[PDB]
Symmetry: C2
Subunit: 202 residues, 2 copies
């Protein structure tokens, strides 16, 4: 194998795709392996040299891993263009109380965070639908007048979808690139790192 990549669920919906596409077009000779998994798994596998690169969020728990700040992803209210709030670019955080949501199941870290900071903010929106797949959530949102909580970037990837900013912010996480320290990377791994970083410089 030439390059094993693992990322937490959300990056699969807007980040890793465009990146691996570019990487492949540049170094077609390198075969790629991509797996979306929980940060615990990514960290574990990187320590066991079962993965070359990882993408997750701070803080990193394993001391043997190095973390390179990638980007700051903040959750937003993702809706269809026909959702009554779509007319806005930003709405009060208090708007969530009346939102009927479609959320990822507890399995996902994002959901976990949503629950934590919602209760923290005194917000208890009604979860009418739950799914264990981001795409399913997006699919349901496109066809309904419901909403979801996901990083804003995912919305820029779909026309019928729009990300509404929350004021004040519910959750903001720092995306990071993970690799095992004191471990020499292949030329592929290094070019990967570089490219990932060049993409977040815009």
């Amino acid at each position: 194998g030439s390059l094993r990549i693992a990322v937490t669920p959300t990056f699969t919906s807007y980040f890793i795709g465009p990146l691996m596409a570019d990487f492949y077009a540049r170094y077609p000779s390198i075969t790629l392996q991509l797996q979306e998994m929980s940060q615990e798994k990514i960290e574990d596998m990187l320590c066991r040299d079962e993965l070359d690169v990882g993408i997750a969020f701070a803080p990193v728990h394993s001391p043997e891993l190095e973390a390179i700040p990638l980007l700051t992803e903040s959750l937003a209210l993702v809706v269809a263009q026909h959702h009554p709030l779509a007319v806005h670019e930003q709405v009060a955080l208090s708007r969530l109380h009346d939102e009927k949501l479609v959320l990822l199941s507890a399995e996902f870290a994002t959901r976990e965070q949503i629950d934590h900071y919602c209760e923290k903010a005194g917000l208890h929106p009604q979860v009418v639908i739950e799914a264990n797949s981001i795409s399913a959530v997006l699919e349901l949102i496109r066809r309904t007048s419901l909403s979801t909580l996901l990083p804003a970037a995912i919305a820029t990837q779909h026309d019928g979808l729009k990300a509404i900013s929350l004021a004040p912010p519910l959750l903001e996480r720092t995306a990071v690139l993970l690799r095992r320290k004191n471990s020499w990377q292949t030329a592929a791994a290094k070019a990967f790192l570089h490219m990932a970083l060049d993409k977040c410089a815009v």
Copy 2:
């Protein structure tokens, strides 16, 4: 105004379940829905333990306590972007796979397993340059490259930039099925769901 737990195999998530769940929700907004995609072995098991109300997978069903209602016929196609050299065709010879550089689902997936099986059976050994454990990742990769993939043609009708090329002869054809535990009485939500799923397939 209660609940309804649904589970489907990976491929249905990318074209079937979404539109159906949205319709069901608009029709019966009081019912809270639970959707989970997983291996058929898990769906079957969970249905047996009354942990799921409805399942969607393929024939043959292994568990004898489960009932199986034929839903539709899903056949694998070569899915590519519109800028893919073969996109101009609607159907191509199965032999064209030898020259295709693919992006496929990993072994974890049943579809992948099937592909590897019938490919070998057909004497086809295409080169897999990229593997992922998510259909969306595969599709995302195909849209931005000139690579192809093997997935049920329907998936393509959900994306503009994508197109499904029919294979002649066909590589794989599976029978989609609705799963529920027999001798088990369904809720009104479960029943209405079953109905809607069938109305959508002209079944």
